[PDB]
Design a protein around this ligand. Structure first.
Ligand SMILES: *[C@@H]1O[C@H](CO)[C@@H](O)[C@H](O)[C@H]1NC(C)=O
Lengths: 49, 49
């Protein structure tokens, strides 16, 4: 029976593989709800006559 | 509440005391629209004491 928990040793002199990285996963779904999380940013200046 | 959208209209006016639901005309302007998307079949009021 071995210890489940463990921790990386993050000294600054570690190699790129051992270098800590922060990764963000952006998950998208459509459960057929009217909710919307986007919006356009296109608006040309108006003209007249 | 239709097609997953909740709509609210309102109109406020002072009234002359005793008489209930006086004769007159007053249209209800839109107030609030939310795309909640939930079934509603029953409702209940709230009050403060
Ligand atoms: C509302 O009721 C209908 C019919 O029973 C059902 O198809 C629909 O998925 C329900 N929606 C919610 C949000 O409960």
């Amino acid at each position: 029976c071995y210890f489940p928990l463990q921790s990386y040793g993050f000294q600054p002199t570690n190699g790129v593989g051992y270098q800590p990285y922060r990764v963000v996963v952006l998950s998208f779904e459509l459960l057929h709800a009217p909710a919307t999380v986007c919006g356009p940013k296109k608006s040309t200046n108006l003209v007249k006559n | 509440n239709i097609d997953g959208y909740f709509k609210i209209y309102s109109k406020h006016t002072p009234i002359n005391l005793v008489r209930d639901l006086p004769q007159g005309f007053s249209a209800l302007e839109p107030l609030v629209d939310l795309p909640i998307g939930i079934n509603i079949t029953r409702f209940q009021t709230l009050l403060a004491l």
